[PDB]
Ligand SMILES: N=[N+]=N[C@H]1[C@@H](F)[C@H](n2ccc(=O)[nH]c2=O)O[C@@H]1CO
């Protein structure tokens with residue numbers, strides 16, 4: 001009910017759309033009876049007029065319902081189905097440790113993640129640095145892995161929230177990505193199709209974040225929390241910092257290396273630790289695996305300390321067709337770059353500003369990400385040993401160590417790193433890694 | 441300069457587009473490098489933010505320049521190149537008499553017209569009721585006809601303002617038709633491609649008009665007048681009445697019959713006469729064929745009275761491959777409907793309201809217009825003997841005479857005519873046929 005153009009006109013003129021109208025439109029997107037022009041027109045009317053809560057809910061549920069929705073009840077698991085999503089960043093590798101940590105604490109994490117977009121890394125691309133790792137197991141194999149290991153990290157198959165495929169593709173060429181209702185519906189259509197009991201959302205704040213201001217990061221978090229809880233998925237959001245690289249590394253193989261060393265306790269970037277732990281705590285509390293923050297933290301620290309989280313990661317890698325000895329032998333499997341060399345600042349001083357969007361784009365330019373979908377990734381390139389805001393840099397502390405595919409590439413990356421970072425004669429003021437928590 | 445999505449974003453965020461940006465976008469439409477989604481997105485940003493005068497000018501000129509632009513200088517004609525456009529209506533047959541009248545007064549009228557759209561008739565469809573009449577002469581033949589006869593009425597060929605083809609096609613499925621800058625640019629891209637010295641625009645007001653209110657009809661007229669004069673084409677606009685059928689007939693063959701009888705002086709609907717004459721007067725004054733209204737009217741009345749206008753019409757029909765004896769023998773050439781029968785009102789009274797949009801749609805439903813582009817027209821169907829507002833109707837005066845293709849069709853049309861017309865115990869207040877004139 002019923003006309004695409006009539007629905008566009010209704011929204012254009014500032015009226016709220018009914019659930020029936022929204023479901024009709026989303027169905028028409030799925031079955032290719034509504035054209036790209038019509039999708040773009042509706043998207044733009046939503047950019048201008050926004051959507052009320054009932055509209056946002058309707059849009060999200062219609063997109064979720066446009067394809068396969070997973071259900072876990074019939075496996076009779078003894079734990080909650082729980083997951084995490086991030087808006088994306090640079091060195092945002094939390095999922096590689098968070099999935100195994102929460103699984104080791106009794107959760108089940110059917111994580112449908114994504115490839116890199118724009119300036120941000122993608123969990124699936126990082127995982128594809130592991131030889132043999134399969135992000136596309138078949139339906140029954142995915143179920144087997146979740147049952148046996150407790151976590152798997154996979155791509156979106158053609159049958160999951162298919163209406164979002166054309167919707168996002170159109171948004172991304174028509175300047176209609178940047179809309180809270182559209183983002184909310186797109187994110188949740190995919191995550192709610194996982195058949196969750198609980199969810200935590202990591203919404204980034206800062207120069208490496210998508211939303212341009214703290215207040216808009218906050219509004220997005222509020223929308224996602226509202227919609228997901230309405231669907232009976234216990235959901236909270238954390239607003240977290242992306243004013244510098246989160247991990248000590250940015251790339252693909254380099255970030256997998258960081259995740260393994262974090263799980264084994266060789267090295268833990270403290271900011272990456274704080275965000276990872278905070279997100280895991282939300283998942284345990286919302287999933288009813290812990291009653292409070294202190295209990296949740298104790299459980300999560302225990303699975304790090306006793307090696308259980310690292311073991312779950314190893315089992316996940318093996319289940320998804322990576323090597324069976326990956327945790328112990330990662331160094332032989334992860335590809336090494338042709339040239340690895342530190343980049344030093346031109347002057348002595350404290351790291352004061354870091355344009356994290358520019359750092360992300362430097363990794364793309366190195367071949368560690370894509371400018372078009374057909375682009376091929378070099379899995380070895382990127383940054384390690386990232387200087388942090390407030391670090392004193394000199395001849396003994398570089399800005400970063402650059403891993404490059406050849407020497408010409410290295411020079412371009414070094415210029416970009418230097419250009420993205422400002423030094424000052426004093427360290428900048430501290431900022432929290434987690435600014436705040438949003439609940440129903 | 442340069443990015444389609446960047447241009448959409450700029451307009452989305454309320455900035456004015458440069459001439460360079462607008463020309464780039466219109467070129468991208470023409471060469472199919474800018475997608476339907478991107479066209480729809482831009483169109484919707486223009487719906488919301490409008491366009492300044494420089495933007496409206498840039499958009500119009502870019503669309504005009506996207507294809508062939510005619511030039512008449514090289515034929516060394518001794519008269520102005522002048523034309524008329526109407527927003528459309530029901531019984532809006534003025535062009536069939538206006539072209540020949542102005543040609544008989546020394547103007548040259550290269551009229552690129554259109555088919556019916558929505559509820560309104562189309563000059564090209566009316567002309568295609570004349571057997572053999574060719575709305576698509578080749579370029580050199582069109583030039584020959586203009587030189588020899590002074591007027592021809594033709595369709596838009598694939599090479600004329602081609603950017604408008606995809607632009608209008610997208611607007612018409614995305615609720616972005618109803619935008620003054622977009623309408624202005626679309627109308628003028630085609631008319632200015634005719635290589636005009638002068639132009640008159642007929643913008644309709646009322647229930648059969650496109651713009652929903654008098655004030656918006658006025659704003660549209662002002663935009664068209666502003667843009668066209670800026671391009672060095674001396675342009676004025678008349679706001680004219682479409683609160684009832686303008687001619688005494690609505691359809692295709694029936695309206696051609698009315699045009700011939702008007703030219704020969706058998707019968708002249710006075711309202712149709714007033715609008716036709718007023719538009720012709722604008723063309724003579726703007727084309728410098730007359731210095732004032734009284735002189736213009738005298739010249740136009742003379743070519744009616746001496747048979748010269750009717751002769752030009754006959755010569756135009758013959759030149760465009762219709763019959764050589766069409767004026768004298770039209771009755772044998774124009775197709776007759778299967779059933780012609782008057783429809784009487786259910787009660788006695790004065791014709792008080794006539795929903796002219798509904799009357800137009802009744803003609804479409806009869807098969808006299810199209811609901812989809814592939815629809816085939818029955819050229820014989822429609823209305824004649826239309827009652828006018830303020831007419832007393834009874835057993836001796838029907839609401840209309842309906843020409844139908846079979847009897848089932850007739851009954852449906854009779855119901856629709858009765859439904860579209862309200863009677864009252866008193867005649868409604870007079871309204872002008874021409875509300876006002878807009879000049880630079
Ligand atoms: N916050 N935020 N927005 C980012 C993300 F949330 C949003 N996005 C990504 C992928 C997707 O499928 N749907 C979708 O809506 O686009 C932005 C760029 O990545």
Ligand SMILES: N=[N+]=N[C@H]1[C@@H](F)[C@H](n2ccc(=O)[nH]c2=O)O[C@@H]1CO
Pocket residue numbers: 527528557558608617622623624626627650651660
């Ligand atoms: N006034 N007005 N608007 C009418 C007309 F001016 C406008 N229109 C028609 C044809 C076209 O090619 N371009 C174009 O813009 O669409 C409306 C429906 O016919």
